């Protein structure tokens, strides 16, 4: 996360690295997702709108999962073995995030709904707990 | 239990405030994505959606409720705003009906929330100084 002894850190630098290794370079990708009449002017305006839209699309999902302002955020949703039966070592040491995305693509929407429901339940439970004071 | 018949955008609009509070993520997730004449309307629509979402997010942020669906605050409820009981608000009212009631007092509540959040931040800074 702070790159002690890293050869070099750059946008998508750890794209071919394993998920475990690429998980220590999230800051590198995260900080480049927002910064980087004539025909060109319209194209630039469309590009800016697209960038804002794409950034906010992920930011909203992070917000409604309770992971706002976090790069690695643990959740209360247990991992259903049906989504992927590979061992933890088989995922974080012998696989890359690009390969992983191709495996859990079919189950992404199911996971997202579970995360949203879990966050809502956590918020309600916290409200109830605080109401006892 | 978790046995919702079906969850959809605004599906709980007719349910009580208590029951509709369990479907916040249903609405929250559809607030961002539910030249020619048609080419400019689409761009304006996209920009407008982004602006509205960011306005709501900013209001949440300055209240200390950033990244929260149900956020509790330190602002006591004023009986002037609404004298109805808690039981008759969360079990005999829909959010649509409630909104039409606390509308002349929404700006007052927003200002109170902002002031309280600022005071909380200042107090937290003061306390951290001692440590």
């Amino acid at each position: 996360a702070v790159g002690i002894g890293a050869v070099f850190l750059g946008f998508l630098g750890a794209a071919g690295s394993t998920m475990g290794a690429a998980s220590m370079t999230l800051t590198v990708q995260a900080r480049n997702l927002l910064s980087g009449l004539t025909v060109w002017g319209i194209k630039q305006l469309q590009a800016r709108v697209l960038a804002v839209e794409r950034y906010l699309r992920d930011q909203q999902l992070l917000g409604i999962w309770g992971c706002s302002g976090k790069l690695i955020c643990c959740t209360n949703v247990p991992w259903n073995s049906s989504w992927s039966n590979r061992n933890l070592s088989e995922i974080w040491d012998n696989m890359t995030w690009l390969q992983w995305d191709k495996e859990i693509s079919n189950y992404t929407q199911i996971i997202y709904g579970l995360l949203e429901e879990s966050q809502n339940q956590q918020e309600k439970n916290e409200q109830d707990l605080l109401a006892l004071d | 239990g978790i046995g919702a018949v079906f969850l959809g955008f605004l599906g709980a609009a007719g349910s009580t405030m208590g029951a509709a509070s369990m479907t916040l993520t249903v609405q929250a997730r559809n607030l961002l994505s539910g030249l020619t004449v048609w080419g400019i309307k689409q761009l304006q629509a996209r920009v407008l959606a982004v602006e509205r979402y960011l306005r709501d997010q900013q209001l949440l942020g300055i209240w200390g409720c950033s990244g929260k669906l149900i956020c509790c605050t330190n602002v006591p409820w004023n009986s002037s705003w609404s004298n109805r009981n808690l039981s008759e608000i969360w079990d005999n009212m829909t959010w649509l009906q409630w909104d039409k009631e606390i509308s002349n007092y929404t700006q007052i509540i927003y200002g109170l929330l902002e002031e309280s959040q600022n005071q909380q931040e200042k107090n937290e800074q003061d306390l951290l100084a001692l440590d």
Partner: antibody
Amino acid sequence: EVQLVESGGGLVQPGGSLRLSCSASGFTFSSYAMHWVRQAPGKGLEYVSAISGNGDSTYYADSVRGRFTISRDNSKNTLYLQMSSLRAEDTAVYYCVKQAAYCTRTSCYYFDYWGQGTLVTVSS
Amino acid sequence: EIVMTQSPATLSVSPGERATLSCRASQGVSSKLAWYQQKPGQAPRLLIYGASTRATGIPARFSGSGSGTEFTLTISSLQSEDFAVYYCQQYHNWPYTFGQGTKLEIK
């Protein structure tokens, strides 16, 4: 195994009242929505009413809205349907039905199991 | 309200052949279609959900296919106990709607 047994059906005069009960066993009753589906003689199945797992939300078909009342007793694993001011067109075979799954980002109102069904006849 | 159209109203196929049952929706219901079998004097039994997935305990003879507006149910190896009215249900738009049914006759 999942079992749903209906009861309470019978002959009722028009404008009368009738209550059906469905005892469900073999699954977590409170975690699944329960529907009432009726099949008028010589006609296909049609939706009557539905209720969520915890019973907060109840849904009614336009024809029966304001006259029927669906309720559940999670403790006793029972599902009720209280009909009032019945009409001649309410005669059918009422099935207490279990929703197959509970999904948040999609629609899942397909039915894993159906009760045997009880005939309700409205006539003078 | 989505209207589900089932054709043919009645179908007669001798045992051992393939029987194809078709269901049509007034508007696209994605892949959200379910098939039920109702033998006389019995409650309907779920066969297919999602238009292609087979319910637990359903033999491999029943095969479902289709997406959007056109759906079909295929019974590769008809048997003497497949005589029943088959209903197609859409769970895409509330309220859910059932087809009028397709009586299958043992020729």
